[PDB]
From a paper:
(A) Overlap of X-ray crystal structures of protomers of Apo-[name], [name] co-crystallized with N-acetyl glutamate (NAG), and [name] co-crystallized with L-arginine. In the conditions used in the assay, [name] with 5% DMSO displayed a melting temperature of 48 °C. The addition of 1 mM ATP, N-acetyl-glutamate and L-arginine showed positive melting shifts of 2.0, 11.8 and 8.6 °C respectively.
The L-arginine biosynthesis pathway consists of eight enzymes that catalyse the conversion of L-glutamate to L-arginine, appears to be attractive target for anti-Tuberculosis (TB) drug discovery. The arginine biosynthesis pathway consists of eight different enzymes ([Fig fig1]) all considered to be essential for *[name]* growth *in vitro*. In conclusion, using a fragment-based approach, we have discovered inhibitors that bind to novel sites in [name] and [name] and to the active sites of [name] and [name], which in case of [name] show on target activity against *[name]*.
Numbering used by the authors:
A (entry chain A), D (entry chain A), F (entry chain A): 5 to 294
B (entry chain B), C (entry chain B), E (entry chain B): 6 to 294
The structure:
């Protein structure tokens, strides 16, 4: 209210280059962290999805739900663990993971976005075979370890996916997918978002995180980088904290696969999506090909 | 081992019904043993792929009462039913939605998708495809609040028909928001009839764990193969409580313009093919009267 | 220098209006200092590109009175105005058309096209997109022939909406043929209102070189931020002659079904963004009453 | 009636793999022999065409009419003969052949199919220049012999043809076609069916015949083959009865030209088309590439 | 040898009629000497290609009475006419259909297709494009059964207009099934008028072996260049029997909404171009009155 | 009136080969000279455009206006000149040129054509960025000379242009266009017509001129040529009168760029367009590739 009108006009006017770049384009947004627990942040995130939609941009939301899965497994008395930052997934764990991600977490996000209109539609790789999985192992200090029904996205039905977007819908993706034999696997949502971004030819991949950005020499807070190329970023990979490794592996996968830029942004900031896309604050970390 | 001239005649006799159903919507209420027995559920999924590959447009509406009850038990959530409806607190809704959409519908989508890229899971929440209005129930003349239980109110018919025209088979979990965004749990039988009417379906099929409608249960000589809605409405107060929702659904759909509704025996492998492409006279057919 | 959390809130607060305008036509009357000052005209063109890149469909109707007068002076053509309209001989029409379509509209098309392939210049002559009917004016009760001056008569709404659906921004020069093919000059304010009504625009924006409607000009305490068409029609005979065409245009558009018309201050950089995506309460909003 | 219901269900269920393979695909069916004279067989054939149509399959019927042509020529007192299994065709014979095939035989089939709906449409290569002919000779013991206005299908308008099928029609093709100079030639219907099958990218070519199938060492009835590759089948060609040579030359042409399989089936069997397509009886003879 | 400025004016004078017919259906009844003489039939086929390549949509309905009679003679089938219609036994129908569709229509399709991929032969049997209803005739007041003779009953207008929109020229043989599937022979003049009305044709052209309508046959001073349907209905009982079907066809078409029907001299090379693109006043034009 | 009807029929019938060649095709017509000053010729030209339109042909009109520009500059007291047959173009001259061409000359032609229906739409390269310019110099006896804001057509938006034609419109093109930096240049209308003809894949380019045709040895009136190949025509280029050089450079550009034929036709003849397209008078000069 206190802000003079000519200043508001200038903020709107400065969005124009970014509206032109994104009009009619796909933007994949990986949604997770505390941005899915704080109620103000969640409603702002959903409003930003409706914002993109009402500018003619095509958002695609890919969500996680690690803590919600862990909580439900505890409530049911199912003992489990993690190893490479991935959840060890028995058939029993997979059923719970799928039921929490698609039947609880994805449902809340669909309903939050739909307070703005008939846009959000929940999907998994199972639906219309929209994408498939291949079982993956993880490295426990150089040795490859079986962790059950954990997968990487293998193939994606680009055409059917873009058909949802053509109808004016915002796909909300829960990261489960069948392999070639129909066995459904749990996929880390960061890696799935990168696979979807590459497959759909997205103009950008946004990854919400609970951090200011990428630090090259953590915990040295002077090591924070606003922009980095994939060559330099791949060298940091052995050095990074285990919590960032999927975020970086996803950025590398997307940008090496042709997505013009991927962005690690602070999901703790209200309207972080609008800040990243329509402002030139230099905030977060931008990854480009190099 | 069957002579080929006999197989040919079985196939040839399907032709009148292929003609009647080609390009038409068929709403199938799926539940009971057809959903839990492994032979029956695989045959049901195959029958959905069969309809799809004849150019027929199936729409599956599924239930999941026992699965919900089992999960509530595991989580220690005690609840009641009233007038056949589950008393739905916000906690019960969350579990119901998570079981129906994240477990039961998921099993059917995967079973159907073994045949091709056809099944898509949806609730009324998705693209606001349908809405709910809160309903009460009258237990001994008094209207009773049972929480977040709804009836299907409005349906985006155009969007639904676009889905089936694109060759998808909607697998519908019966949850939907009201006008204020509050998600309600809807009884799946009532929902299937509402969807059948809204989409202008040519048939409503209601899978049940019984041979058909008995006027004098359990006497198998009281079984009715075909009945009009007028007579069936008179029979309704006399029927066993387990059949009431099935009959109320058939009545609503057929009075709402669906040419026929069918209570069919879901214990029979390929019950959908038997009902649609054969003139066995099995189950109970409901027509307008 | 502005904190990022403040920029975010400015952007977030545009969302209700992005929703209201997405896919809708907005007719903008462009003239006055917004058309001559180099900072304002570049911001106006950028605002048209802004609307286009939000999926909104702007349609610009421009004036050019002073530019016409200047060219007539250079060519030695002496003429008059009557009742605010230019006495239009065939010679005056040729100059008016050449200045409006071949000079003024050309500047705006090029300014907008610095942002992309959007602007297309058109008069009613092109594809017979709209027609004129000759009008007279009454000066002291007597109806006076003022030559080839017209009002917008019929509009090919379907063709115009096809243009904007294709992502083009029509830049309209206000000239049009009558039923016999004779091209008339149309006052741009009256034309913008006629186009807004014909296209079913969601808003009509009228850029003016004033803060808004004053009931007691020049006293800035008589400024009206919102008014209904009934009260505004009563105020009309009392207003300064410079505001009469602006008010008559708003009245015609809103009585003709446009949800709201806006007299906004074209002296303000980005006046279009301010009006549409901000709730500053600036200018004068006209609604049906 | 006596057949138990669970058996009927199983027969229907076993059609599913073949319905999936043929849904949305073209199937060319060459119709001829006694299946066009017996009234029960003819109505069953037409019902099978309506069956395919009402499963979302796209049948294209190509018909012959050798005996009907011969009968009309006899009625008119026009003397003629055969040489390489092909009719010697003067201009006078061509006019009669065209009038009988398109104006009599094709008309009966169109009306039989249309008892089931508005599907069948009669066409020749003349109509919309749907296909052209090139004059062909035949070999009389190693010497090439002119037999008049007899042709092979040269080019086919694949796009216009598929447009008829897109409108939900079942083309009924009489095998006459103009050459490049407009001279209409009579084309053997077996060879024309193979040319149409190749041109339309058909999934299968079905050839109705008055025989159990292909015998490799006729008349040894133990030489009947249910499946044979084109390499092996081409070697039999000099050995075969003159009545089968067009059936085999058509199968070879279609399958070498990319049609996944061609089938010689017994047109004496009611609903032979349904038996072949939706049953795994192993009946008839299937030809595949080898 | 003709001066080029004269050719230019002949071409320029076609423009009003190109405008009237562009995108419109023209139904042409083809028969008589225009169908048998080799110069005339080649010019007729070329004129059909001409219309097609102007964006006009010709639909040809052809006859073949003498050809049918000749084939029946060769086959030894004796038959009669009654009231101008052929007594149609199943045997006569088979020959009529085989001659009309398998011989006469084939010649025209091939002649037209020398100019491009345009002509397609169809009867009412094909895709059930039109149906017949059995008709009798009254010979001296008594209604007489004449076998499988029909009138055009219903027409799939949408399917026919799809054909011409795809750039095809339908060549129609006048045979069609009734409601029970029985194919009837239809008089081609009556059929052409029924098709013209059903397709909303802009013109019906009826080629005839005469200069036009004579009120006092054979006196060439009784020739009528234009007449309204009211007066022409009064003249009908007075006309020679050979003109009756032509006049009854024009009356039916124009009373059924076709703007004009034309009896034109098929003995004249390029009679179709002369009628449509020239204002010679030749033939007889029938308009509503 | 005096002309017998069978002669009129034959004139119409002889148009048929040319109607078949042009149906559904683009024809670019450069309109200029006295055909834009004589009132009978102008109305005949507009009628010929409506004629083409009502035969299903797609005309595209490109117009000039040299004398009208010169007249307006004189009225305004702006001194200017020519050098290589091109107008020396200051910013001041460009503004007048654009205002006269688009706001006066193009307007008269649009209204003349529209007396026949809703067909003509005026456009410049500025509109929807339909085409761009690159500044060009001219040769003054072997030395390259800057003549201000004069351009050649550089790129053309073929798709957007054909969209206007698909709606049934006749584009009337005024030859102004921006360069890559937005600076609008004046383009010689002959060269622009050739660029548009090449870009749209036109079947023919027609250039109205005030001459009988191309003379190879002017003024020898026996040197008039009805047809010439581009190889031979390029050799004449150093010899020709300065007034024909753009006409020839345009024909060469169009035909070398793939337009099947370009035609220099006498704009002094009423209905010259119909004479050229639908008559085989051999009039004018036809240019083909060689
Ligand atoms: C394989 C794996 O770890 N999946 C994640 C899915 C959700 C997320 O990525 O946050 C899990 O927690 O089970
Ligand atoms: C309101 C209500 O009881 N809904 C059902 C939904 C499942 C079903 O109908 O089978 C329930 O058990 O919760
Ligand atoms: C009739 C009339 O006065 N037209 C205006 C057009 C321009 C404008 O409205 O600004 C004129 O000054 O000629
Ligand atoms: C060339 C030739 O023999 N044509 C065949 C056509 C019909 C058929 O193949 O059965 C004929 O009998 O004349
Ligand atoms: C019923 C009838 O007489 N039909 C006509 C068809 C041909 C025509 O009209 O020229 C006939 O002679 O058989
Ligand atoms: C660069 C140039 O000479 N343009 C031309 C445009 C019109 C025409 O070609 O006739 C001019 O006269 O200015």
């Amino acid at each position: 209210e206190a802000l003079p009108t000519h200043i508001k006009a200038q903020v709107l006017a400065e969005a124009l280059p970014w509206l032109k770049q994104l009009h009619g384009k796909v933007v994949v947004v990986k949604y997770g962290g505390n941005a899915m627990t704080d109620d103000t942040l969640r409603r702002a995130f959903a409003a930003d999805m409706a914002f993109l939609r009402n500018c003619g941009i095509h958002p695609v939301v890919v969500h996680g739900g690690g803590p919600q899965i862990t909580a439900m497994l505890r409530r049911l008395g199912i003992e489990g663990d993690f190893k490479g930052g991935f959840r060890v997934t028995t058939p029993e764990v997979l059923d719970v993971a799928r039921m929490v991600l698609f039947g609880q977490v994805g449902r809340e996000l669909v309903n939050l976005i739909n307070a703005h209109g008939p846009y959000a539609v929940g999907i998994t790789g199972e639906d219309a075979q929209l994408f498939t999985a291949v079982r993956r192992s993880v490295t426990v200090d150089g040795v490859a370890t079986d962790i059950g029904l954990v997968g990487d996205v293998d193939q994606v039905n680009t055409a059917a996916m873009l058909d949802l977007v053509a109808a004016g819908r915002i796909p909300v993706v829960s990261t489960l997918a069948p392999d070639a034999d129909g066995v459904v696997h749990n996929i880390n949502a960061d890696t799935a978002a990168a696979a979807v971004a590459e497959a759909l030819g997205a103009e950008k991949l946004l990854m919400l995180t609970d951090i200011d950005g990428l630090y090259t020499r953590w915990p040295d807070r002077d090591s924070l980088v606003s922009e980095i190329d994939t060559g330099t970023l791949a060298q940091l990979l052995p050095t990074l904290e285990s919590g960032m490794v999927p975020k970086v592996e996803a950025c590398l996968r997307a940008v090496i696969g042709g997505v013009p830029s991927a962005h690690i942004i602070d999901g703790r900031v209200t309207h972080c999506v609008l800040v990243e896309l329509f402002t030139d604050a230099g905030t977060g970390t931008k990854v480009v090909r190099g």
